[model samples]
Target: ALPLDTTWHRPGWTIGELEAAKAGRTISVVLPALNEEATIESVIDSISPLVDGLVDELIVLDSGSTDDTEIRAIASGARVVSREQALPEVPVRPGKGEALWRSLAATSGDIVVFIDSDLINPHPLFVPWLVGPLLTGEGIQLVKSFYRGGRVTELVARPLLAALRPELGCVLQPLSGEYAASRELLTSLPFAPGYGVEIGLLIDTFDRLGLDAIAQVNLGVRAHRNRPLDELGAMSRQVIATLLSRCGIPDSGVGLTQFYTRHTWPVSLVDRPPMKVMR
Candidate 1:
């Protein structure tokens, strides 16, 4: 067994208690998306009810989707912020981490909750459950959800952390994208802005806040679209680079070549500095 604090793993919280705990402390819900036209509305509609209660700002950070993602999200009652629009002056980084980093400029909430854009049937309590621990003020700077089978997580991220950072081996889903974090914390940590984003944040959180400062919420099974093996190959390299770099091999980032490819896919090794200095 791993020495970890999972006190908030089970489900237990009322809308009323969440509101009281919020106590005027604002919350922002941001969905960093690409071309997720198929399931945008369902995700937006699932959590829209929290608008005036536990949530203050609900934004879908559009990542130049060619599909109807923007249209669907807007129709479902979410305020959409485009990649260029979030921080017009700076050049955009082309990945989920880029959109997430840009969201800091677009949203205003003491606590920010991030949900993956591809959820097929996201739970109504997904938002509440993620933000619940932060409202309690247990000094938790980050809350990552332990959801259903994340193929890459189980096969790659989990074993990596269990070996490299054994203390954090307790985190069931280190690569889970669904999480909530304080502006104070997000602003101060560097963002890996690619496939490495989730794991990078997890390791960085532990480094900055210690074990007790991070919490894992039980989100049960998350229903989302699955990825084929080819796409995961590129993702795995980024994930590996991110983990190893933090584990004393800062020079782990390098290009990965696959199956007689003429050129190597550059690992997403560049990380944006903490948003705190940007503002």
Candidate 2:
């Protein structure tokens, strides 16, 4: 575990910053789900109350769940929509980025924030911390949060920062799921598939908008399911691919397997066919 310097972030505001947002400015939360029935309920329950005042809309965008994920999400009062219905213009593909991109149209918030559906400990802090920067500041386009996911720590995000801009390593976790951004930034960027999405967004936003426009929040703790070493390797590859692409490295004429980026070791029966369709 790499020790991170905590002082390199913007402090003094929280999710409560929503109250200060311009009158009538709305906020929305997007949760990307893929066959997540078993865990969706708990996540929804945790978010509903905590985000009461700040979140004007709560969405659950599923990437074609074969299970009761759709039914469970609707029961939880989340505005449920499949990746297809949300994105009729673009052909549906099996990637978190695809689902999140589609969510842009379905959402109405001036400030949009996304939370993963499988979180075991979804807290109010997640929203305030991630969303606050955008709600309170001017020209503030994004706020991404990060914390430990299993053994993966600031160590993983370090390599990414070094590759992109080592001087900015003060921003500990780069691939943080808990992020808040304005609709302006969201609409301007072209989103790709796989683990590269987060880093891709970061790089593009930095280029088009600059580093001062972005912020990172310390959510204290973000506990979610951790993938095995094998799966993590896949994550590392896609992430690396995404970063490399940003560096103007053409696909290298090498096609990487998209399905195995997770850290799953001793593969389990749970590894079924992905919901995405390849072109």
lDDT, each prediction: 0.86, 0.69
| lDDT per residue (tens digit) for residues 1-279 in model 1 | 345556445567788888889877899999988999998898899889999878989999998899999998989989999989999999887887888999999998999999998998888899888887788758788998886567788899989888889888789888888999999999898888578888998899899889878888888787787887777877888899888878877755667776755557767778889998887
Model number with the top lDDT: 1
Per model, state how many residue pairs clash.
0, 10
Residue 125, model 2: lDDT of 59
RMSD of each: 1.7, 6.6
lDDT of 2 by residue, 194-215 (tens): 6567777887788787777887
Candidate 2: segments with Cα more than 4 A from true spot: 1-17, 50-52, 148-157, 256-279
Instruction: Provide the lowest-lDDT 10-residue window in model 1.
Output: 1-10
Q: What count of clashes does model 2 give?
A: 10
